[PDB]
Paper text:
Here we describe the 2.11-Å resolution crystal structure of full-length AlaA of E. coli in complex with a substrate-mimicking acetate molecule locked into the active site in the binding pocket of the α-carboxylate group of the incoming substrates, alanine and 2-oxoglutarate. Despite the fact that several crystal structures of alanine transaminases have been deposited in the Protein Data Bank (PDB), the structure of AlaA provides the first glimpse of a completely structured bacterial GPT active site poised for catalysis. In addition to the constellation of electrostatic interactions that secures PLP binding through its phosphate moiety (including the side chains of Ser105, Ser239, Arg248 and Tyr68*, and the backbone amides of Val104 and Ser105), the covalent bond with Lys240 induces a strained conformation in PLP that enhances the reactivity of the cofactor and is further sustained by an extended network of polar and apolar interactions. In accord with the requirements for transaminase activity and control of reaction specificity, the acidic carboxylate group of Asp207 keeps the N1 atom of the pyridinium ring in a protonated state through a salt bridge interaction. Secondly, the crystal structure of AlaA and the other alanine aminotransferases possess an N-terminal segment with two distinct portions, a proximal, generally folded structure that participates in the dimerization interface and stretches over the top surface of the active site; and a distal U-shaped loop that we have termed the plug, 7–10 residues in length, including Tyr15, Ile17 and Arg18, which ends in a rigidly fixed Pro anchor residue followed by a helix.
At the crossroads of these pathways, several partially overlapping enzyme activities collectively known as glutamic-pyruvic acid transaminases (GPTs) or alanine transaminases (EC 2.6.1.2) participate in functions such as alanine de novo biosynthesis, which is essential for the bacterial cell viability (since both L-alanine and its D isomer are building blocks of the cell wall), and alanine degradation, depending on metabolic and environmental conditions. Recently, the alanine transaminases AlaA and AlaC and the valine-pyruvate aminotransferase AvtA (2.6.1.66) have been genetically identified as the three major alanine aminotransferases of the model organism Escherichia coli K-12. Alanine transamination in E. coli is catalyzed by at least eleven distinct transaminases, of which the three predominant enzymes are AlaA, AlaC and AvtA. The reversible transamination of L-alanine to pyruvate is a central metabolic reaction whose relevance is stressed by the large number of enzymes capable of catalyzing this transformation.
Author numbering:
A (entry chain B): 2 to 405
B (entry chain A): 1 to 404
Amino acid sequence: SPIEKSSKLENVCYDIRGPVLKEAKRLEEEGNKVLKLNIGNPAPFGFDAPDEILVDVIRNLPTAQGYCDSKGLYSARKAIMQHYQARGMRDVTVEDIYIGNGVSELIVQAMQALLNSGDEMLVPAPDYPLWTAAVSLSSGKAVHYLCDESSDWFPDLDDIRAKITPRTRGIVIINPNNPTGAVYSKELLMEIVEIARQHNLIIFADEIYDKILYDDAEHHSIAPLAPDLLTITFNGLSKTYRVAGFRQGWMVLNGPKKHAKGYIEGLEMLASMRLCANVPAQHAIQTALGGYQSISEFITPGGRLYEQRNRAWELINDIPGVSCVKPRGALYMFPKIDAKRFNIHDDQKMVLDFLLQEKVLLVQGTAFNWPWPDHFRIVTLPRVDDIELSLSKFARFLSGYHQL
Amino acid sequence: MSPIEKSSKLENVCYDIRGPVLKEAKRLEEEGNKVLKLNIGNPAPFGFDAPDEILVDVIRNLPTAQGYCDSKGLYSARKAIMQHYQARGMRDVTVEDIYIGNGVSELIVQAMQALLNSGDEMLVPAPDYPLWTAAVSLSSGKAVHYLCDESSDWFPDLDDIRAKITPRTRGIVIINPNNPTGAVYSKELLMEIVEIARQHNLIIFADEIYDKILYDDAEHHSIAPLAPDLLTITFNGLSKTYRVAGFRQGWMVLNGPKKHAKGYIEGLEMLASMRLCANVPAQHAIQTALGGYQSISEFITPGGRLYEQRNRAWELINDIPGVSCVKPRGALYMFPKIDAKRFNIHDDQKMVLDFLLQEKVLLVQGTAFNWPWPDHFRIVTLPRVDDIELSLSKFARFLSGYHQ
Ligand SMILES: *Cc1c(COP(=O)(O)O)cnc(C)c1O
Ligand SMILES: *Cc1c(COP(=O)(O)O)cnc(C)c1O
């Protein structure tokens, strides 16, 4: 009598961490070093937490050993409140803010309390794979709207309107975008709002990279651009403040809310179930959002994030058969590859073949629900030396690669 | 502006250790009233401090734990858990069979999500820890409650279990030592539960998070070694025993023949990587807690505060007219029975609410633990004695002239 996985997991595929790592983990155990450009994890690439965060966590640790409120510490939620109040989200109270074990937990919770069987969620393609998985896990269906590579990976508005059904409950916006690195203009975001307003949709805004911007890139939160709509905004400390392991994220409810009291009680229900998010690291939030922002040094010209993005950009375009749109934010690149030139029918196989030959780990584009096997994603976190070595390996790999 | 209700999967979910009565208490606290909250097993506000050996290990390892770790958790942490259960006769367990989550709560939910399809039944004790019922319902499963026998030291009634087994039953939940009854099950009882699970091919889910909080000559028996031929999942953590609930550190261990449940395990691993990882810094405390000297021994012995508080609370609650209670041999709770007809109790939530409004003390009604009748409630034994009598002498005055 076999015990298979539940039906709610039949479509689920969040695997940036998938069966390719099985061979990667094997190579590592054998002693071979594998350059992992697959995960946006700051610490393995030499990114340390700001001292101020570490100091305040250590200081409050003996006082944070018990359960806190399910929504999180008041002072932390107060800091989050003030942060968004300085962006035009004035009516946000501490009761509109939920702190969880990273944004990941809250994304799932937000969908669990919302979706029923048959319900549809508009999700970008390419996506952040958790969003698709979360919707599916919540018994909803992820309907993918296309992002337009020829338009700097901006969402296709005509595609979004065309894929709206009477079952669409909301639309997911990931801005700045993982994995394209796109930074959406205010004009486009205003178009999304109009669509959401006309079709009675809830806007979910994953803005976890809103402070990782390059050059003249300017982040616009969609929440204060939709003051008359109920919107939910996600952000955290993982990427911007390089403390992914502390698991600290939050979601903020903005807009009219009395028509959504039922949904809110569902969220408060899911938060109460697990009692609370981890407490000691919540004391870091106030220090992170307040005072000096250390991320400014990394994204400015000369900063390692800026230079690594530039270096990966130069090398990936100097490869025959590969092009890419330059990221204006976040930590990723989503290069297009001439699938016909290399006879690529399975982009996962290409990733696997590249791993086995050059010991470098990428993520195939279809893992981000891109309909075609002509893309992949690289992370710009590694040192310039590592990026140069891995991309030259990739160039050598592709020069003699004809997928069988 | 159509109404946004909570999802259908949350319609039959409660977990009311935290809710409307709790909501009232906080209002009272805002309003200038000091309230003695005995609703939750939270050690820290009752003068319980983190084992300083745990603190110094987390502090020292904090700068090295900023990034994502393996989804199942830190290797050294899982190493300790493996060895801990190795010593208790589960000699086949490896690191791959261990999942570290943000407290046991997260793992309980995940374990149900990956297992249960719509209509699938899970045997859950009555009374239960309400998260179990919530997690089953949340996963679209049905929580089928088997009664525990108050006249038999709150032991599960084996006849009631067998009478409620249907072809839809997937597994059975065992909370041992028990929340809320504080019962410590015998090896002979646990052995018969194994026999039941063996005949009907049921997965055993063992919540053994109080396995080290024992009184008198009470001996804990893990059901996993007693069922070496069955798949069993055991839950435990640092929250209660090691008084660091706020750190949110728990683990679940898979034991037995796992080949026939490959799909279910793949589901667990999927849910496991969906959130990337559990909070990493506090995972360095597992090795410290599980090894060397156990500080919990000072609290449980006849000199310890937990032993004493358990005593004085049991004797005080029994002397109250119309109230009786079975003495707990473990955990941190009591589940007193009240003579409903004497006070005309038809709703136990209103009773707890009245006691809160009358005397600023917060309890939890028994129906919050899925007990079918309004003739029970729960007391936590964490407060040191001074507040135990205060609140119980308070509870005595309340009942002396109460009529619902
Ligand atoms: C990295 C990432 C997350 C994960 O956030 P956590 O706070 O670490 O859980 C969520 N969404 C996006 C788009 C991400 O890139
Ligand atoms: C307190 C408790 C939990 C929750 O444990 P955490 O690790 O803090 O999430 C789970 N099960 C039982 C029986 C409990 O008493």
